[PDB]
Amino acid sequence: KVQAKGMGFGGNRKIGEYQFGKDLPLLEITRDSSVEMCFMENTDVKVVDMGHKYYSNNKPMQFTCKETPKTYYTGYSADGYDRDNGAASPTNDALYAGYVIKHMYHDWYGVEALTKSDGSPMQLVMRVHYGQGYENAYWDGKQMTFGDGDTMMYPLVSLGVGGHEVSHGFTEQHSGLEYFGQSGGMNESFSDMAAQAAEYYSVGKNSWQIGPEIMKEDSGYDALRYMDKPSRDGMSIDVADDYYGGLDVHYSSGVYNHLFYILANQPNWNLRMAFDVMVKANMDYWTPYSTFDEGGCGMLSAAKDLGYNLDDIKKSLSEVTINYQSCYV
């Protein structure tokens, strides 16, 4: 097998169709020239076509690429497409999203996005077309799985959704924030922060929302979540003092989502600087049962290591009613 390039399409009916090879770079694929077969796979990312099944052998998506129709059109029909539920090619978008997320973590932090139990780098396995009408995505400890959506959502393959799911793995392999209570809200938030960071890495801008690009225009929802004012969704909370023990992690995530938005918008600050503090806290300070307040201490320690302004962080923490005075015993 050799290194090859893939030309084709991505996007969906809402955000529009674009072309790998014109609007965005070509995709990194592999080819077995002896059999004129190509694979949606490279060293860093493997795309699996689940075929709307709930299980798979996780072999890479494979498609015919003939010397006489190097660069080849993607898709089982060699036309650049892999259409499903209003998306041009969720498998192309998954291969690109994995590239972006892998290179964001390498370029910004010199770290693998994912690693095995023994520290060896872990290939990003992006499993697409999962299930029948599955309107979600999930991380399972070793790979990222994305449905094709149904009446409410387009296929859930985007930079943001991919960044969110890969970063559940980043958290599991670092702080290990447990997926309930306050630590679980932080876990969810870090993944929503990484969705923004992936967008910022790719195009230098981010929506401050989760999933607007995959919500159908007739669903009645503009987005899954809003980071500037989480309570816009009717359930998420904007400050730590509004937390209660029965609040799901997808709603208590509003605390650190709002905090991330606030910090990134302090004078002189940007998304990358805010994410630097969060990533370093996840890597070096946050503990599996962290409270919101303890997570603020970790942010402060991380910022001190990086040389970043602590008063700007303290002001942001106070705005989401996190008690950082506790950090100084």
Ligand SMILES: CC(C)C[C@H](C(=O)N[C@@H](C(=O)Nc1ccc(Cl)c(Cl)c1)C(C)C)P(=O)(O)O
């Ligand atoms: C970026 C996205 C795709 C990540 C996933 C996610 O947030 N999507 C769902 C959600 O809002 N769930 C949710 C909300 C409330 C409760 Cl009570 C529970 Cl149980 C789950 C769904 C609505 C698409 P993930 O965190 O599960 O991997």
Ligand SMILES: [Zn+2]
């Ligand atoms: Zn999540």
